[model samples]
Target: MNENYPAKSAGYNQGDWVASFNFSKVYVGEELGDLNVGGGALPNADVSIGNDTTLTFDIAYFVSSNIAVDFFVGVPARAKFQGEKSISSLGRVSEVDYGPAILSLQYHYDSFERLYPYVGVGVGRVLFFDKTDGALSSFDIKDKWAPAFQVGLRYDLGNSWMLNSDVRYIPFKTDVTGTLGPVPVSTKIEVDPFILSLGASYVFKLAAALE
Candidate 1:
């Protein structure tokens, strides 16, 4: 059995720890839905909509030989519209805001010495602030539960350090609850975005067997 396990002696060095930082360029898609303002008798009210590009920052911690956890934080992205439209008495509302903090957990394949691959899932919240004239004025874009999937590869750089890169797809949505002024509105926007990241890590040896 020992002969079949050539690298068994080199297995993760028992209590090793690693820390990493990642940055991703994210692209957010527009919302394809109608808005209902002020819950009034008039069901047909015109409203504007738009979206913006997003950026994300992430940090990860390796707590075990084959498991890791990560936390992500980001800014709220702005939404845009094609033209100004009137909804009842509400005037020229141009854009909406989305995107917020994100967090995730991952499992890694750590049986190899040179290469490591990992997969993960996450949940996030999107704060939909009100938009007026290309800026956020006042409104509550309902918080959302976004589920994300990730896949990444890492290369050992010797001396308990490694190079890492990853790509992820996150499915996000938010409810536009009209506030601010006259124009009761409600709608859902899907901001399914894609992110690509590159970073590095340093591993800490907490416990290991050496011959």
Candidate 2:
């Protein structure tokens, strides 16, 4: 520690909490198929989810100076399905909203001074809701769990304020089932997306953990 630089001035300590607001974007990766189409299971078609841009929040707790736990929320991501080429007449079938809750453990490398760099890994659960199905078929997502990973940087702006940015990735699977008028269709869909965020936050020290 330097003489002039305050011990509390930079870096994290046990019991410190950080909260931030961020702008997030999802680069959707999808692979869709049907199991009961035309009387046989099939791996066909692709579903496209438009790039989602939403604002979200994240919180972190310094369990130790170099280790922390973090969790973030997913704002409702709204997307629609693009029918298979052969069923182009089906066009866009339905719209759905999904939100994931992520929890992770992070290790802040003890290298950078002005900024703290960290890597994290975790598991998350997403819930799907408000699915508006078309006349030809209904659509939805099967609420499930996914693996999450992230990297973050925090720049201290003196005492409590800091500039922050984070990037997270998740391997998500969305199971879809619906009745196609007189037929039933089922498929597994992968909507893996990259979540990017940038924001600012303040550190709140709980006293007992501080010098």
Candidate 3:
């Protein structure tokens, strides 16, 4: 604990709940492996998605002073897919909707420090739906589960209010099917995205609020 960290009272305790609303940016990383078309493998048939913004909400429940569980969710956001070689070779293929539901086990530090730090690890599923296929005959995606990880910082603003910033990495892969007129195409897309967020957190200690 640094001397000038900040004024301190009782830290987070059991039965405390924290809720937050965050603005997030998602950056996608793709490993466009070989596209399996029927039985033939095609090269240069790749796809890429543009970045997107998300307005998300999350909640944390403290089971102990240093341990918490968190839940996060948000509405679907649009992400545009572009072709690189042959498949989306024509141009922008589609704008698709995607969002995730995540749960994590977090450690709220016991240190009486001003700048509080926390880390979390968990798993969740990503949903992809409602696509507008621009030039392709058709586009479809399947839902899949992915691992989640997080690192974040929070600064106290008196007792019940605080500011927080965090980044999460969710890596998932799904099977997609597309069509060009009559020919069918199949590919696996790995969406490794980092959701970076900035938000404010409000805390309520049940012991005081209930008693």
Residues 4-117, candidate 1: write the lDDT tens digits: 645545436434555665566655544345554454543433333333344455666656666677666665566544322343235444555545566777776546656567
**What are the TM-scores, per candidate, against the unseen true structure?**
0.58, 0.72, 0.72
Using lDDT, rank the candidates from best to worst.
Answer: 3, 2, 1
Candidate 2 residues 1-211, lDDT tens each?
Answer: 5476555564566667788667766666454555556645554664455554568787878778667787888666566756454444465756777676788777765665775578888886667675764334465445678778888876666666678677888876666556646544456666667878787776776756433
- Which candidate has the highest lDDT of all? 3
lDDT of the structure predicted as candidate 3: 0.69
Error at 28, model 3, angstroms = 1.6
Candidate 3 local lDDT, 88-119, one digit each (tens): 76657666776678777776656576866788
- What TM-score does candidate 3 reach? 0.72
lDDT assessment of candidate 2: 0.67
Candidate lDDT values, in order: 0.58, 0.67, 0.69
Please give the lDDT score at residue 78 for candidate 1: 65
Query: In model 1, which range of ten residues has the least summed lDDT?
Result: 80-89
